[PDB]
Design goal:
With 311 residues, the protein is of the alpha/beta class. It is 35% helix and 16% strand. The longest helix is centred in the last third of the chain and has 19 residues, at 291-309. The structure holds zinc ion.
Length: 311
Amino acid sequence: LIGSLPEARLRRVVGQLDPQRLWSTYLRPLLVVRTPGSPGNLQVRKFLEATLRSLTAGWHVELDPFTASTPLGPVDFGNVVATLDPRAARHLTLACHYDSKLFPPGSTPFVGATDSAVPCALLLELAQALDLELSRAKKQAAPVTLQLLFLDGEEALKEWGPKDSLYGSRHLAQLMESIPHSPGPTRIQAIELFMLLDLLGAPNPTFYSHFPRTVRWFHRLRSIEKRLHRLNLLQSHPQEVMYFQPGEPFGSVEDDHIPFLRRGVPVLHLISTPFPAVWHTPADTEVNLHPPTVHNLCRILAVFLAEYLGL
Ligand SMILES: [Zn+2]
């Protein structure tokens, strides 16, 4: 299709992905209890920061720390914000949440492998696999850069009503609205597209377009799935289209995009609906992930990113 990578550039891009790196260097370290305010959450925050700072492209990496009221009293939250080129007029923003949902004491510990350790790991792997190309685009002052958001506090702490959720995204969207950007006028308007990854890594996911505004990008993802299938680049993928489905959504849900959506940001919500079978149970673990699906999604996203940013 027009603006698609030539086959030769596509196979090179896919070949820069390293499945073992994704799994062991980016995913495995996240698979700990990481509820807001916990030591594990702080350790994951520092791991994300250090990993992002290590990329040779030289990202601007900053924390958005704050304290908020919760059903458990005041709790500290910290969003990790990585912007490749902070001088660029606008950016594609890819987002996910790095907290894990708090369960009661004496429960089987919940580590949220699909929700959202896999999303987090995918963003890290994409940034690393495309690091040389991203570095060159920044050095050329490309007018659209890349931003990665690792949001804290997406999950409710006690399922205690509508304000016990989305702590990090609500705070960050309000913060961005207060910060000037050129041309902006604020950092909210710098977001050209907000792509939220959530509930990824289970077998047999299904994705629908939730926002007519951004359906062209949903169609691009679907076309990339079909193309990779026909190129013999997907595993355990017997039908041409499995993940990106046509039609009205099975259902739409509140998530970290909402504070951005409400401020006019265009959103693509890349979330499995129906949710994974393991959703919000302690069986949402590494062993219940489907590795071929994880790597297939990584490949689809890598091609999407290279096409979107002209890498
Ligand atoms: Zn969840």
